[PDB]
Every structure is written in C-alpha cells, then in structure tokens.
C-alpha cells in the first residue's frame with residue numbers, strides 16, 4: 001500500500017503525504033536523504049497552499065529554541081517543537097517527532113510545487129542545531145517495530161517510498177550494495193568514472209573530494225570542479241557532431257530540438273563505479289542522457305522538446321541527486337550500513353541502450369578512494 005505514494009514535478013523534488021498534530025493536519029512533505037531536519041511551513045507564504053497551524057494542535061509542544069538551516073539551494077529559519085506525525089500511505093503508526101516550524105524562508109519554497117515541508121532522512125550528525133535533535137526516521141524506528149531501512153523508487157512525476165523494507169516488484173535484476181562510509185550524510189565512495197566506456201583517468205580521491213553523497217533532495221548530479229571540467233570535456237567530445245553554447249554546459253541555457261527529434265544517440269552514457277562490500281571490488285551504475293538532460297516543461301516552448309544539462313559543479317563534493325536516482329531502486333539499509341542499487345521497474349532506455357547496475361569489477365590500484 002506504499003507503492004506509488006510519491007508525487008512531484010520534474011526538477012522540484014518528490015513528496016509524500018503526511019499528517020502532523022492533533023487533530024491531524026495533512027501536508028505534502030519533500031523526501032530528502034540529503035539532510036536530517038523535519039521542517040514544515042508554519043506561517044503564510046506566497047508559494048504555500050497551506051501550512052502547519054500549531055495553535056490548532058493540542059499535542060504540539062514548543063521546545064523554546066530557534067533553528068536555521070541553509071541548503072545548497074534555499075534556506076529557512078524556524079522554531080523547534082514536537083508533535084504527533086503519521087504517514088497515511090506508509091506504515092500505519094503514529095510517532096512523536098521533532099518538527100521545525102518554518103516562519104521565515106528564502107528561495108526555499110517553490111512556486112507551484114505542491115509540497116509544504118521537508119523530511120530529512122539522513123543521520124543526526126548533520127541535524128541542526130546539533131546532533132541532539134533526533135531525526136524523524138530515528139524516532140520512527142525507536143517508537144515502532146519498523147525495520148531500520150527504507151527504499152526509494154523515483155520515477156508531473158511519481159514514485160514509491162517503502163518504509164521498513166524492500167519491495168521486489170519495484171526492481172529487476174540484482175541488488176548491488178556499497179558501504180555507507182560515514183553515518184552523517186549517506187556518504188559513499190566512487191572509485192571510477194567512465195564516459196562512453198572511457199576512463200576519466202583521475203586519482204580516485206578526486207571523485208570524492210571532499211565527500212560523495214546520495215541525495216534525493218538535490219536535482220542534479222553535482223561533481224567536484226576538477227571532475228566536472230573533465231566530464232564536460234569528454235561529453236563535448238562524444239557529442240561533437242553538434243556544438244552547443246558554453247551556457248548550456250553551465251546549466252544557464254536550454255537546448256531545444258523540434259518535438260520528437262532529440263538526438264539521444266550523440267550523447268554518451270556515464271558510468272559511475274561504486275565501492276563494493278569486498279576489497280578492491282566495485283559495481284557500476286550507468287546513466288543515459290535521458291537522465292542527465294532534464295526536460296523543462298513550458299507550454300511556451302512546447303513546439304520543441306527543451307532540456308537543461310543536469311550535471312553541474314560543486315565545491316562540497318559529489319552529490320548523486322534525483323537525476324541519478326531516477327530509474328534505479330535505491331535501498332537505504334541503515335541497519336547494515338550500506339546502500340543498495342538495482343534497475344527500477346520504471347527505468348530509462350530507448351531501443352538501443354538501457355540504464356544498468358552491474359558487476360563485479362576489480363581494481364589493481366590499492367589506493368583508498370575516500371578523501372579523508
């Protein structure tokens with residue numbers, strides 16, 4: 001009953017329905033594996049269709065402490081409190097959880113997005129103000145019998161968040177696991193990057209400077225500057241049969257083709273190799289251009305299909321965002337400190353190429369690829 005419990009708009013995150021307070025107030029909450037605070041709009045905002053009204057909840061408790069959270073995109077400030085929370089299309093339980101009531105924000109809420117809050121699914125180590133603010137999923141596991149694991153199938157868009165287990169109907173083929181290196185973000189280690197089979201030929205620590213994370217709340221694949229520059233050079237080379245403005249590669253400009261004529265075949269597949277659970281072993285996930293060229297829906301331009309380049313540069317490490325996760329079934333196996341990847345039931349492919357998760361591969365270079 002948790003299948004298809006996610007909705008969203010392309011480029012604007014995926015959200016699940018939740019209720020907060022007594023009596024229950026229904027809100028749509030963005031699912032974010034890249035942070036650890038549960039926060040909801042709690043005052044009027046031009047982009048909010050509704051918001052949390054603390055005065056109407058008999059179970060609300062004020063913690064008398066403010067909190068400020070700046071993300072890569074957007075920021076908000078609010079008041080900490082606790083209240084009862086449920087997930088209508090998830091496990092049928094009610095938990096008391098920490099909630100940040102957002103009273104002020106900047107470039108956080110999105111015009112027309114349909115969500116009103118955010119559910120940080122990562123570890124307490126990156127919770128604000130500090131790690132004593134227990135994250136939602138931690139409270140869920142401690143207060144119920146839900147297994148310490150969840151999975152995401154991200155596919156107007158939709159998908160599934162399966163709390164407490166793995167749904168086999170949501171993937172095909174084998175599940176490959178990579179270790180969670182450190183429990184703060186969902187940090188992983190990339191050991192190799194290929195563009196159309198060609199190795200970027202870089203010290204593998206560069207791929208993980210200064211960390212690499214799996215983040216459902218970020219749209220793009222974000223790469224460390226040095227890796228980004230090398231990747232763009234190789235994607236340009238592969239696609240050189242057409243020449244695009246430098247602004248396209250910087251994600252500042254759309255590229256458009258007559259409806260139905262997008263030249264998918266001139267763009268390369270990107271393979272990211274992730275550390276396996278065994279010494280010097282890895283597996284790879286392969287991303288097609290249908291993933292990293294993000295469609296931008298706009299009726300004004302609808303004579304064409306137009307796209308934004310959804311790989312961009314980072315000064316804070318690699319972020320495997322929604323563009324990478326889409327078309328894969330991703331298991332956040334907290335209990336066993338590992339992340340699993342499999343090909344999703346809602347996968348990308350044309351008649352020539354298919355996204356894949358495959359292995360094992362072996363590396364002769366014994367260098368640890370973790371940056372720290």
Ligand SMILES: CCn1ccc2c(N3CCCC3=O)cc(C(=O)N[C@@H](Cc3ccccc3)[C@H](O)CNCc3cccc(OC)c3)cc21
Nearest residue numbers: 011012013034035070071072073074108215217218219220
């Ligand atoms: C879905 C909306 N959206 C669209 C683009 C886009 C985007 N960017 C910017 C450039 C390329 C790219 O993809 C970045 C973010 C982003 O910052 N996401 C947040 C959640 C969020 C969701 C919705 C709105 C605002 C924030 C996430 O916690 C970040 N994790 C690591 C992170 C970074 C910094 C602090 C931190 O604290 C926990 C966590 C959201 C984006």
